[PDB]
C-alpha cells in the first residue's frame, strides 16, 4: 500500500485498504475507520463495487431526481465519498472548522456552515434526502462568496465549489450537457 494518507497526503499512523493500495488516517477517511474488519475495503473500493454490480447506475440522471432520493445506505455512501473528495483538495482547510465573521463592510452569514459540521451531520444520520447534504455543501460556498465580497479571497470559494460540483456530477452520474 501507499505511505501517505490519500486525503491529506501526509504520513502518520495509517490504515491500509485490503483491496486497493490507498491508505488513510482514521478521521481522514469518511466514515471514520472501523475497529476490526478483516479484510477492510475503502470508500474508493466500495463506490467502485456499486458501479460494477449495477453498470446502468453510471447512465445519466437529472439533478432534481438525484436530490430527492432518500438517504438509504448507498446514497449515504455517495454523500460520504463526495464529501471525502472535497477534503482531498488542500483548499478545503479554509472551510473545515467553524468560521467567525468580523470584517469592515460585511455582515456574517445568517446560517454558518463548515465541513466538520456536515461530516458530523452525515455520521449522525441527520440528512433524510440527498437534497439535505447538497444544500449544506452549497451554503458553505455561498456564505463565503457573499462574505468576502470583492476581495480576491472569494476565489477559494469558487475553487473548492468547482471541486464539489465536478465530483457531484461524477459520483451521481448527472447527465452531461453543454
Ligand atoms: Zn490524512
Ligand atoms: Zn480501497
Ligand atoms: Zn444489473
PDB file of C-alpha atoms and ligand atoms in Angstrom:
ATOM      1  CA  UNK A   1       0.000   0.000   0.000  1.00  0.00           C
ATOM      2  CA  UNK A   2       0.777   3.746  -0.116  1.00  0.00           C
ATOM      3  CA  UNK A   3       2.800   5.559   2.573  1.00  0.00           C
ATOM      4  CA  UNK A   4       0.746   8.746   2.669  1.00  0.00           C
ATOM      5  CA  UNK A   5      -2.893   9.355   3.555  1.00  0.00           C
ATOM      6  CA  UNK A   6      -4.946   9.624   0.395  1.00  0.00           C
ATOM      7  CA  UNK A   7      -6.948  12.598   1.565  1.00  0.00           C
ATOM      8  CA  UNK A   8      -4.313  14.739   3.323  1.00  0.00           C
ATOM      9  CA  UNK A   9      -1.054  13.447   1.639  1.00  0.00           C
ATOM     10  CA  UNK A  10       0.954  13.289   4.881  1.00  0.00           C
ATOM     11  CA  UNK A  11       2.488  10.319   6.592  1.00  0.00           C
ATOM     12  CA  UNK A  12       1.484   9.231  10.086  1.00  0.00           C
ATOM     13  CA  UNK A  13      -0.429   6.382  11.691  1.00  0.00           C
ATOM     14  CA  UNK A  14      -2.186   4.886   8.696  1.00  0.00           C
ATOM     15  CA  UNK A  15      -4.700   2.186   7.883  1.00  0.00           C
ATOM     16  CA  UNK A  16      -4.309   0.306   4.581  1.00  0.00           C
ATOM     17  CA  UNK A  17      -7.146  -0.760   2.227  1.00  0.00           C
ATOM     18  CA  UNK A  18      -7.001  -4.555   1.615  1.00  0.00           C
ATOM     19  CA  UNK A  19      -8.426  -4.357  -1.931  1.00  0.00           C
ATOM     20  CA  UNK A  20      -6.587  -1.271  -3.281  1.00  0.00           C
ATOM     21  CA  UNK A  21      -3.218   0.341  -2.486  1.00  0.00           C
ATOM     22  CA  UNK A  22      -4.525   3.589  -0.816  1.00  0.00           C
ATOM     23  CA  UNK A  23      -4.029   4.295   2.886  1.00  0.00           C
ATOM     24  CA  UNK A  24      -5.747   6.508   5.427  1.00  0.00           C
ATOM     25  CA  UNK A  25      -5.522   8.184   8.766  1.00  0.00           C
ATOM     26  CA  UNK A  26      -8.526   7.330  10.958  1.00  0.00           C
ATOM     27  CA  UNK A  27     -10.640  10.524  10.824  1.00  0.00           C
ATOM     28  CA  UNK A  28      -9.480  11.491   7.298  1.00  0.00           C
ATOM     29  CA  UNK A  29     -11.452   8.581   5.869  1.00  0.00           C
ATOM     30  CA  UNK A  30     -15.235   9.068   5.817  1.00  0.00           C
ATOM     31  CA  UNK A  31     -16.771   7.252   7.651  1.00  0.00           C
ATOM     32  CA  UNK A  32     -14.001   7.070  10.194  1.00  0.00           C
ATOM     33  CA  UNK A  33     -12.079   3.783  10.006  1.00  0.00           C
ATOM     34  CA  UNK A  34     -13.859   0.877  11.611  1.00  0.00           C
ATOM     35  CA  UNK A  35     -12.436  -1.056  14.585  1.00  0.00           C
ATOM     36  CA  UNK A  36     -11.756  -4.539  13.127  1.00  0.00           C
ATOM     37  CA  UNK A  37     -12.989  -5.626   9.600  1.00  0.00           C
ATOM     38  CA  UNK A  38     -10.523  -8.171   8.079  1.00  0.00           C
ATOM     39  CA  UNK A  39     -10.333  -7.677   5.183  1.00  0.00           C
ATOM     40  CA  UNK A  40     -11.192  -3.971   5.078  1.00  0.00           C
ATOM     41  CA  UNK A  41     -12.047  -2.047   1.908  1.00  0.00           C
ATOM     42  CA  UNK A  42     -12.139   1.723   1.476  1.00  0.00           C
ATOM     43  CA  UNK A  43     -14.785   4.144   0.166  1.00  0.00           C
ATOM     44  CA  UNK A  44     -12.969   4.160  -3.222  1.00  0.00           C
ATOM     45  CA  UNK A  45     -13.437   0.386  -3.428  1.00  0.00           C
ATOM     46  CA  UNK A  46     -16.981   0.446  -2.060  1.00  0.00           C
ATOM     47  CA  UNK A  47     -18.122   3.059  -4.547  1.00  0.00           C
ATOM     48  CA  UNK A  48     -16.450   1.014  -7.301  1.00  0.00           C
ATOM     49  CA  UNK A  49     -18.287  -2.166  -6.182  1.00  0.00           C
ATOM     50  CA  UNK A  50     -21.646  -0.336  -6.558  1.00  0.00           C
ATOM     51  CA  UNK A  51     -20.875   0.679 -10.179  1.00  0.00           C
ATOM     52  CA  UNK A  52     -19.684  -2.857 -11.046  1.00  0.00           C
ATOM     53  CA  UNK A  53     -22.844  -4.524  -9.543  1.00  0.00           C
ATOM     54  CA  UNK A  54     -25.248  -2.172 -11.415  1.00  0.00           C
ATOM     55  CA  UNK A  55     -23.475  -0.750 -14.512  1.00  0.00           C
ATOM     56  CA  UNK A  56     -26.636   1.220 -15.526  1.00  0.00           C
ATOM     57  CA  UNK A  57     -26.139   3.318 -12.344  1.00  0.00           C
ATOM     58  CA  UNK A  58     -23.481   5.108 -14.477  1.00  0.00           C
ATOM     59  CA  UNK A  59     -26.219   6.186 -17.001  1.00  0.00           C
ATOM     60  CA  UNK A  60     -27.215   9.852 -16.928  1.00  0.00           C
ATOM     61  CA  UNK A  61     -29.581  11.214 -14.242  1.00  0.00           C
ATOM     62  CA  UNK A  62     -31.320  14.579 -13.606  1.00  0.00           C
ATOM     63  CA  UNK A  63     -30.078  16.608 -10.601  1.00  0.00           C
ATOM     64  CA  UNK A  64     -33.715  17.085  -9.483  1.00  0.00           C
ATOM     65  CA  UNK A  65     -34.125  13.280  -9.345  1.00  0.00           C
ATOM     66  CA  UNK A  66     -30.807  12.850  -7.532  1.00  0.00           C
ATOM     67  CA  UNK A  67     -31.510  15.451  -4.805  1.00  0.00           C
ATOM     68  CA  UNK A  68     -34.945  13.947  -3.888  1.00  0.00           C
ATOM     69  CA  UNK A  69     -33.519  10.469  -3.307  1.00  0.00           C
ATOM     70  CA  UNK A  70     -33.768   9.220   0.263  1.00  0.00           C
ATOM     71  CA  UNK A  71     -30.548   8.757   2.109  1.00  0.00           C
ATOM     72  CA  UNK A  72     -30.579   4.952   2.027  1.00  0.00           C
ATOM     73  CA  UNK A  73     -27.228   3.120   2.629  1.00  0.00           C
ATOM     74  CA  UNK A  74     -25.929   3.642  -0.933  1.00  0.00           C
ATOM     75  CA  UNK A  75     -26.871   7.358  -1.105  1.00  0.00           C
ATOM     76  CA  UNK A  76     -25.314   7.728   2.364  1.00  0.00           C
ATOM     77  CA  UNK A  77     -22.060   6.282   0.946  1.00  0.00           C
ATOM     78  CA  UNK A  78     -22.107   8.562  -2.112  1.00  0.00           C
ATOM     79  CA  UNK A  79     -22.641  11.605   0.058  1.00  0.00           C
ATOM     80  CA  UNK A  80     -19.788  10.307   2.287  1.00  0.00           C
ATOM     81  CA  UNK A  81     -17.458   9.836  -0.712  1.00  0.00           C
ATOM     82  CA  UNK A  82     -18.441  13.211  -2.280  1.00  0.00           C
ATOM     83  CA  UNK A  83     -17.533  14.896   0.967  1.00  0.00           C
ATOM     84  CA  UNK A  84     -14.214  12.992   1.113  1.00  0.00           C
ATOM     85  CA  UNK A  85     -13.324  14.267  -2.405  1.00  0.00           C
ATOM     86  CA  UNK A  86     -13.595  17.838  -1.080  1.00  0.00           C
ATOM     87  CA  UNK A  87     -11.282  17.126   1.955  1.00  0.00           C
ATOM     88  CA  UNK A  88      -8.773  15.726  -0.620  1.00  0.00           C
ATOM     89  CA  UNK A  89      -8.221  19.252  -2.113  1.00  0.00           C
ATOM     90  CA  UNK A  90      -5.834  21.155   0.188  1.00  0.00           C
ATOM     91  CA  UNK A  91      -8.027  24.326  -0.149  1.00  0.00           C
ATOM     92  CA  UNK A  92     -10.624  22.594   1.986  1.00  0.00           C
ATOM     93  CA  UNK A  93      -8.650  23.750   5.113  1.00  0.00           C
ATOM     94  CA  UNK A  94     -10.305  27.154   4.733  1.00  0.00           C
ATOM     95  CA  UNK A  95     -13.798  25.516   5.012  1.00  0.00           C
ATOM     96  CA  UNK A  96     -13.023  22.702   7.590  1.00  0.00           C
ATOM     97  CA  UNK A  97     -13.682  24.232  11.050  1.00  0.00           C
ATOM     98  CA  UNK A  98     -16.244  26.778  12.352  1.00  0.00           C
ATOM     99  CA  UNK A  99     -15.870  30.291  10.870  1.00  0.00           C
ATOM    100  CA  UNK A 100     -16.174  33.698  12.551  1.00  0.00           C
ATOM    101  CA  UNK A 101     -17.165  36.911  10.862  1.00  0.00           C
ATOM    102  CA  UNK A 102     -15.623  40.328  11.715  1.00  0.00           C
ATOM    103  CA  UNK A 103     -14.805  42.428   8.618  1.00  0.00           C
ATOM    104  CA  UNK A 104     -15.409  46.128   7.915  1.00  0.00           C
ATOM    105  CA  UNK A 105     -18.277  46.497   5.390  1.00  0.00           C
ATOM    106  CA  UNK A 106     -19.519  42.917   5.790  1.00  0.00           C
ATOM    107  CA  UNK A 107     -22.033  41.072   7.943  1.00  0.00           C
ATOM    108  CA  UNK A 108     -21.690  37.364   8.726  1.00  0.00           C
ATOM    109  CA  UNK A 109     -23.991  34.647   7.302  1.00  0.00           C
ATOM    110  CA  UNK A 110     -27.489  34.127   8.733  1.00  0.00           C
ATOM    111  CA  UNK A 111     -26.680  30.357   8.701  1.00  0.00           C
ATOM    112  CA  UNK A 112     -22.994  29.381   9.061  1.00  0.00           C
ATOM    113  CA  UNK A 113     -21.783  26.026   7.794  1.00  0.00           C
ATOM    114  CA  UNK A 114     -18.495  24.151   7.587  1.00  0.00           C
ATOM    115  CA  UNK A 115     -17.050  20.758   6.504  1.00  0.00           C
ATOM    116  CA  UNK A 116     -16.719  19.157  10.007  1.00  0.00           C
ATOM    117  CA  UNK A 117     -20.373  20.200  10.658  1.00  0.00           C
ATOM    118  CA  UNK A 118     -21.537  18.407   7.537  1.00  0.00           C
ATOM    119  CA  UNK A 119     -19.247  15.469   8.406  1.00  0.00           C
ATOM    120  CA  UNK A 120     -20.899  15.133  11.811  1.00  0.00           C
ATOM    121  CA  UNK A 121     -24.394  15.579  10.252  1.00  0.00           C
ATOM    122  CA  UNK A 122     -23.591  12.629   7.906  1.00  0.00           C
ATOM    123  CA  UNK A 123     -22.176  10.497  10.738  1.00  0.00           C
ATOM    124  CA  UNK A 124     -25.311  11.280  12.809  1.00  0.00           C
ATOM    125  CA  UNK A 125     -27.750  10.321  10.014  1.00  0.00           C
ATOM    126  CA  UNK A 126     -29.246  13.807  10.203  1.00  0.00           C
ATOM    127  CA  UNK A 127     -29.938  14.011   6.450  1.00  0.00           C
ATOM    128  CA  UNK A 128     -33.044  12.244   5.080  1.00  0.00           C
ATOM    129  CA  UNK A 129     -32.594  13.151   1.459  1.00  0.00           C
ATOM    130  CA  UNK A 130     -29.577  13.861  -0.701  1.00  0.00           C
ATOM    131  CA  UNK A 131     -31.093  17.379  -1.093  1.00  0.00           C
ATOM    132  CA  UNK A 132     -30.138  17.959   2.565  1.00  0.00           C
ATOM    133  CA  UNK A 133     -26.436  17.195   2.145  1.00  0.00           C
ATOM    134  CA  UNK A 134     -26.109  19.129  -1.111  1.00  0.00           C
ATOM    135  CA  UNK A 135     -27.894  22.268   0.237  1.00  0.00           C
ATOM    136  CA  UNK A 136     -25.316  22.416   3.123  1.00  0.00           C
ATOM    137  CA  UNK A 137     -22.239  21.942   0.884  1.00  0.00           C
ATOM    138  CA  UNK A 138     -23.609  24.710  -1.380  1.00  0.00           C
ATOM    139  CA  UNK A 139     -24.309  27.011   1.572  1.00  0.00           C
ATOM    140  CA  UNK A 140     -20.580  26.621   2.645  1.00  0.00           C
ATOM    141  CA  UNK A 141     -19.504  28.199  -0.652  1.00  0.00           C
ATOM    142  CA  UNK A 142     -22.386  30.710  -0.997  1.00  0.00           C
ATOM    143  CA  UNK A 143     -21.693  32.083   2.505  1.00  0.00           C
ATOM    144  CA  UNK A 144     -18.027  32.631   1.654  1.00  0.00           C
ATOM    145  CA  UNK A 145     -18.915  34.426  -1.683  1.00  0.00           C
ATOM    146  CA  UNK A 146     -21.281  36.886  -0.039  1.00  0.00           C
ATOM    147  CA  UNK A 147     -18.988  37.480   2.991  1.00  0.00           C
ATOM    148  CA  UNK A 148     -15.716  38.216   1.162  1.00  0.00           C
ATOM    149  CA  UNK A 149     -17.463  40.486  -1.326  1.00  0.00           C
ATOM    150  CA  UNK A 150     -14.921  41.964  -3.845  1.00  0.00           C
ATOM    151  CA  UNK A 151     -11.808  40.810  -2.005  1.00  0.00           C
ATOM    152  CA  UNK A 152      -9.838  38.275  -4.096  1.00  0.00           C
ATOM    153  CA  UNK A 153     -10.153  35.639  -1.267  1.00  0.00           C
ATOM    154  CA  UNK A 154     -13.641  34.902  -2.753  1.00  0.00           C
ATOM    155  CA  UNK A 155     -11.914  32.800  -5.428  1.00  0.00           C
ATOM    156  CA  UNK A 156     -11.134  29.988  -2.874  1.00  0.00           C
ATOM    157  CA  UNK A 157     -14.884  29.508  -2.572  1.00  0.00           C
ATOM    158  CA  UNK A 158     -15.213  29.220  -6.320  1.00  0.00           C
ATOM    159  CA  UNK A 159     -12.266  26.763  -6.461  1.00  0.00           C
ATOM    160  CA  UNK A 160     -13.444  24.396  -3.741  1.00  0.00           C
ATOM    161  CA  UNK A 161     -17.028  24.702  -5.080  1.00  0.00           C
ATOM    162  CA  UNK A 162     -15.815  23.666  -8.544  1.00  0.00           C
ATOM    163  CA  UNK A 163     -14.141  20.594  -6.915  1.00  0.00           C
ATOM    164  CA  UNK A 164     -17.511  19.832  -5.275  1.00  0.00           C
ATOM    165  CA  UNK A 165     -19.732  20.150  -8.307  1.00  0.00           C
ATOM    166  CA  UNK A 166     -17.407  18.063 -10.587  1.00  0.00           C
ATOM    167  CA  UNK A 167     -17.408  15.162  -8.115  1.00  0.00           C
ATOM    168  CA  UNK A 168     -21.162  15.512  -7.600  1.00  0.00           C
ATOM    169  CA  UNK A 169     -21.738  15.080 -11.370  1.00  0.00           C
ATOM    170  CA  UNK A 170     -19.257  12.083 -11.477  1.00  0.00           C
ATOM    171  CA  UNK A 171     -20.367  10.194  -8.369  1.00  0.00           C
ATOM    172  CA  UNK A 172     -24.105  10.746  -9.018  1.00  0.00           C
ATOM    173  CA  UNK A 173     -23.786  10.305 -12.803  1.00  0.00           C
ATOM    174  CA  UNK A 174     -25.541  13.516 -13.739  1.00  0.00           C
ATOM    175  CA  UNK A 175     -26.363  13.625 -17.475  1.00  0.00           C
ATOM    176  CA  UNK A 176     -23.614  15.542 -19.275  1.00  0.00           C
ATOM    177  CA  UNK A 177     -24.718  18.781 -21.020  1.00  0.00           C
ATOM    178  CA  UNK A 178     -23.259  21.828 -22.796  1.00  0.00           C
TER     179      UNK A 178
HETATM  180 ZN1  LIG B   1      -4.948  12.211   6.358  1.00  0.00          ZN
HETATM  181 ZN1  LIG B   2      -9.551   0.665  -1.339  1.00  0.00          ZN
HETATM  182 ZN1  LIG B   3     -27.620  -5.474 -13.141  1.00  0.00          ZN
END
